[PDB]
Symmetry: C3
């Protein structure tokens, strides 16, 4: 099944706040890693709409005050 | 340049050695492994689709009825390797 | 609104972190991610302006280090939403 792999790279301080947004958006799960260049979230979303809803919330709420980038990659889910 | 399958396996850290063995025994030339929250995340650029699916089937069938996990594929264009 | 970009990923030996970071920056990359990985190794991810930049960075890293150090370089298509 084709899915959207939404990736959010932002400042580590927003880890708890962004994780809440992902969960409240109805994301079934997500990965989070520490990165240099910060924290990187990866979320396979049900549909495009959910990927965009999470992206819009994060951006609108934190991207005037915080550094970050958001992107989508196409993923084909085999299991899970 | 060559189109390849980037197989990604996210599962519990306890299965690191077991999953690594499956990748290697499938004939994977190499793989990346990282610790993750939300766990261990494997990334493997496979020769062909068939090998990507073989590894995915093996891991899922063997561990997923007992452990948490997700397996997916992303298209990658290999420039060097 | 949205823009397609090249997500260049470089996985190599941790010893080359500083050297590869310098190549990315000198190529004109606006930013990049770097993580520690097993398989120590280091993984860079760079969303490049265009394909040409992705390939310039890849050619420099590969030609200058891959005969002596281990590594792979690939590109994945990314759709940038914010940033």
């Amino acid at each position: 099944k084709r899915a959207n792999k939404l990736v959010i790279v932002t400042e580590k301080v927003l880890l708890k706040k962004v994780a809440k947004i992902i969960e409240e958006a109805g994301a079934t799960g997500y990965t989070v890693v520490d990165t240099g260049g910060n924290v990187k979230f990866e979320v396979l979303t049900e549909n495009r709409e959910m990927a965009e809803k999470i992206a819009d919330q994060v951006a609108i709420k934190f991207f005037t005050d915080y550094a970050g980038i958001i992107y989508i990659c196409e993923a084909e889910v085999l299991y899970g």
